[PDB]
Design a protein around this nucleic acid. Structure first.
Lengths: 172, 197, 106, 136, 191
RNA sequence: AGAACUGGCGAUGCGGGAUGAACCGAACGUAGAGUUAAGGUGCCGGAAUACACGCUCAUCAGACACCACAAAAGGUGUUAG
RNA sequence: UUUGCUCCACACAAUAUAGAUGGAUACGAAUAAGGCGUCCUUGUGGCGUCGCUGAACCAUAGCAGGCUAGCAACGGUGCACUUGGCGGAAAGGCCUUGGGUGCUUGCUGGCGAAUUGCAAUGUCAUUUUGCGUGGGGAUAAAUCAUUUGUAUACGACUUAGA
């Protein structure tokens, strides 16, 4: 659609005479529209038990908005997927801009290295990094200093006109 | 708008230089590339060498009339690369060849006029901080170039002559620029400095 | 002004051929100075007549009337598919055709 | 005997760097860099404009040769009321670095009546040049 | 991990400072003045306190990373090559028969004309680059002075001068007449 | 190699995968305009060198399996767990 | 062989078109990078300015740019000559000095506009050649036949011949 947001999917199974108020399952599924998030909810929760699968109801479907988009810190999401050569329980600590943008950038990297299938990407708990010490990443702390200057080559010159006295160059 | 568009070879590529040119040659626009000796590529001289081991068939592999189809002389000829981007089999490219007056090095005095460039023709907008350098002057010399110290000498004679011409060309226009700031105290820069003039 | 002109000299591209199906009924006028389709909304609805001449004097010298009209937008570079009346050739065209700067919307 | 480096020193980006948006919905509006994210997409910030920050690439924003003294923190409206302390917008319209932008912007807003009576507003100065081309 | 900068404190004494523009470095020194072109690595220097040099080197995830150390070593070769120099004291340890080595002069190139080389009557005119003086034996038997003012102009030619008498059948243990480097010392004895 | 059912070819075109009587879409009325999927967007060839996020240095480069299949054992070319 | 052909000037008519409607505007080199101005002991120098593409400069005011005068002038632009330079890749151009004519909208008058009936690719441009006046300059070749035979299937190159 546009961007994988966050929704609130809550289940209750069958609050009837059989099992009055089971456990009320609730997670934080990250998906685009309100269609994929429903299936991934059943995909991440395959530990359900013998009741009925035809009872695909939602307690209160809504939309968990991005918590503080301007707040830029460090987060960690455990990457898990089952390929054909086995599996990989990975975990990155890349500096995320928001709290949901990490998932979008995850599809730009994991599919660029080990070719992660879209029907195998698992979503677990999202960790949060505030202080140092526990930070085992060097490339993250290096880019996070104070009053640091650096030159930047390469420049954009998007044009189509066949007339120029500028003599194109790259300086930024 | 303009009848003939002349493109200079001041640090230009090969296939990238004939990008928007293909859209012009199909329209019958005269475009000429000057200074073939001044051709740089954002690559390497290393790979660019083997141009004979895999370069021949389907004609008469020894003839002089119906044998090979060009591709001979310093790799083959920068002229062959421009044809492949134009519908040669149709007359939409046949008449284009009459417009495409690209020879070698110095053509008829067209470089002494307009030297407009194409945004995606230079290597300056396409070079990685660490990419090797390519020299056609050494590439042509690699396979035994004829006029090595001749062409380079002829080009040098024009650079010196232009240096003496640009000296007086920047002279008379200097008096105009100097009288462009001291003559704005009247009624010219007191009502035009708020509209764009 | 040593020249009179109320038209734009936009470079033509081609006509309406399609994949492997031929049906010359749509032109492909390309106006320079336009990079966005949103700026191609000024140039809508005008006579375009392709530049050519005749031979014998039948109207005054070498004049044979043609007609055309600017249609909707095309592509992303502000390409205009200004279809003509019926005189839609295919003789390897592509030139600065005369586009007619209104029949003013405003 | 000294080292002495010539130039080629581009405007270094650090904590506190006023920029400008050329492409996007906020094209033409002034912006600035308060907090640096990483070695990629800088976190710009428009002062007198009123627009939330977003992930904008370096291809849609360029640096400007103007510096100021402000801390590091992704916040906009703070850099607006206290802008009087570190003013630089007055120099933006004073220097001849951003005058080329309004040169084509204001000219396009001009009508045909104000773009036809300029020939006499350019010959009053040109006449003093013609006499200072051969005689002076 | 894509480093942003890898600055290195380069200790440069006064009197032998260099000129910095684009990618060209000037060698300033009383003992010969030479230049050097660098168009394959793309480096950039920055002055902040005359002696020390603090710059910014990007790209740290391929082969670059620390592309300052590979240049710093070359800088020292231009500083200690114009002051301390590089005198490769090579000793000619050979028996067999007294080889009559006579170096002649030709177009200021000084082609080493080796007459009667272990039974060979071939004149091997080895080209000698300018910027290095070559003498003979004075007090010590069999000794050649390779005192130059560069590295790629002295050591580069010395490698070709050593492997110029390569034999198909014979090699090194056939006769103890191999030209080996005794000690790669310098011109200045104190330094 | 030998059965039941079986979207086509056989007996059916046009478009498209460079090219294909066997695959996908479409079980063929005659113009124009508009709207999908498959197939695309430098030219050849009717189409934006339109944008953001990764990675690489090969004197056998690479860009659609079926369709003249390659595997195991290595290495001081690099990135991310 | 019914005095023709070439160069400058070009009456009245044809054969054209790969698309004319301000204008094809000369520094070179480099991109982990420059140009211009000023200063200086003239260099790998310093200071200042410019850069984010041609949306910048030049050019533009009268019937398809008409017929006059005055003021502001001793500039600028175009056609037709002469003197003084330069050019060897398809050179076939550029600039300067010394005269005359038309024009010269910075500012300031008068006359002219139409009847064409709101526009009709609404012409004042050019590839080549031939046929009528003549002001200059210049007074020619090849093939067949025959002869010589280095050449020779029928041809061509090398023959002789006032």
């Amino acid at each position: 659609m546009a961007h994988f947001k966050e929704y609130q999917v809550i289940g209750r199974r069958l609050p009837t005479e059989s099992v009055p108020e089971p456990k009320l399952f609730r997670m934080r599924i990250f998906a685009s529209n309100e269609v994929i998030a429903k299936s991934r909810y059943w995909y991440f929760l395959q530990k359900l038990h013998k009741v009925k699968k035809a009872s695909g109801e939602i307690v209160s479907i809504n939309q968990i908005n991005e918590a503080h988009p301007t707040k830029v810190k460090n987060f960690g999401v455990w990457v898990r997927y089952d390929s054909r050569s086995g599996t990989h329980n990975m975990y990155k600590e890349i500096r995320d801009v928001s709290r949901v943008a990490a998932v979008e950038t995850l599809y730009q990297d994991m599919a660029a290295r080990h070719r992660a299938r879209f029907r195998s990407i698992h979503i677990l708990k999202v960790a949060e990094i505030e202080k140092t010490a526990d930070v085992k990443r060097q490339y993250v702390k290096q880019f996070l200093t104070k009053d640091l200057k650096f030159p930047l080559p390469h420049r954009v010159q998007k044009s189509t006109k066949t007339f120029s006295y500028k003599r194109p160059s790259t300086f930024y | 708008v303009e009848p003939v568009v002349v493109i200079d070879g001041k640090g230009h590529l090969v296939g990238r230089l004939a990008s928007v040119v293909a859209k012009q040659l199909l329209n019958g626009q005269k475009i000429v590339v000057v200074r073939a000796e001044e051709l740089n590529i954002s690559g390497e001289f290393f790979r660019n060498k083997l141009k004979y081991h895999d370069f021949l068939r389907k004609a008469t592999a020894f003839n002089k009339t119906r044998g090979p189809f060009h591709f001979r002389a310093p790799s083959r000829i920068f002229y062959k690369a421009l044809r492949g981007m134009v519908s040669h089999k149709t007359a939409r490219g046949k008449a284009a060849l009459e417009r495409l007056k690209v020879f070698e090095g110095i053509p008829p005095p067209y470089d002494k006029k307009k030297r407009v460039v194409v945004p995606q023709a230079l290597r300056v907008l396409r070079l990685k901080p660490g990419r090797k350098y390519t020299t056609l002057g050494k590439l042509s010399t690699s396979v035994g170039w004829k006029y090595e110290d001749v062409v380079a000498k002829l080009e040098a004679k024009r650079k010196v002559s232009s240096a003496e011409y640009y000296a007086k060309k920047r002279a008379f226009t200097k008096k105009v620029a100097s009288a462009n700031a001291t003559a704005a105290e009247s009624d010219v820069a007191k009502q035009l400095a708020a509209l764009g003039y | 002004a040593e020249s009179h002109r109320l038209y734009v000299k936009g470079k033509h591209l081609s006509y309406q051929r399609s994949k492997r199906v031929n049906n010359p009924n749509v032109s492909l006028i390309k106006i320079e100075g336009v990079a966005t389709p949103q700026d191609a909304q000024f140039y809508l609805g005008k006579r375009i007549a392709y530049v050519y001449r005749a031979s014998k004097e039948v109207r005054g010298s070498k004049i044979r009337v043609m007609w055309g009209k600017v249609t909707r937008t095309h592509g992303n570079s502000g390409v205009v598919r200004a279809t003509f009346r019926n005189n839609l050739p295919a003789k390897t065209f592509g030139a600065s055709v005369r586009i007619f700067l209104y029949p003013s919307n405003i | 005997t000294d080292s002495i480096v010539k130039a080629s020193n581009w405007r270094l980006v650090e904590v506190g760097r006023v920029v400008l948006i050329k492409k996007g919905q906020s094209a033409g509006k002034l912006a600035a860099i308060v907090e640096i994210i990483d070695q990629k997409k800088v976190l710009i910030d428009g002062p007198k404009a009123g627009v939330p920050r977003q992930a904008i690439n370096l291809g849609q924003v360029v640096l400007t040769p103007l510096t100021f003294a402000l801390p590091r923190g992704a916040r906009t409206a703070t850099v607006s009321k206290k802008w009087a302390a570190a003013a630089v917008c007055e120099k933006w319209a004073a220097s001849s670095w951003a005058k080329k932008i309004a040169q084509r912007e204001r000219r396009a807003a001009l009508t045909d009546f104000e773009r036809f009576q300029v020939m006499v507003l350019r010959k009053q100065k040109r006449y003093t040049v013609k006499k200072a081309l051969a005689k002076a | 991990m894509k480093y942003i900068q890898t600055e290195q404190q380069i200790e440069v004494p006064e009197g032998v400072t260099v000129s910095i523009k684009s990618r060209i470095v000037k060698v300033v020194g009383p003992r010969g003045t030479l230049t050097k072109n660098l168009k394959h690595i793309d480096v950039t220097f920055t002055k902040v306190n005359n002696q020390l040099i603090k710059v910014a080197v990007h790209n740290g995830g391929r082969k670059h990373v620390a592309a300052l150390r590979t240049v710093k070593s070359l800088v020292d070769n231009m500083i200690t090559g114009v002051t301390k120099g590089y005198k490769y004291k090579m000793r000619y340890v050979y028996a067999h028969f007294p080889i009559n080595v006579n170096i002649v002069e030709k177009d200021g190139a000084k082609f080493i004309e080796v007459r009667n080389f272990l039974g060979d009557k071939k004149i091997r005119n080895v080209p000698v680059r300018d910027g290095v003086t070559i003498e003979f034996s004075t007090n010590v038997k069999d000794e050649i002075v390779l005192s130059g003012n560069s590295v790629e102009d002295v050591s580069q030619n010395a490698a070709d001068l050593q492997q110029i008498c390569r034999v198909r059948n014979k090699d090194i243990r056939k006769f103890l007449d191999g030209i080996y480097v005794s000690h790669k010392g310098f011109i200045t004895e104190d330094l």
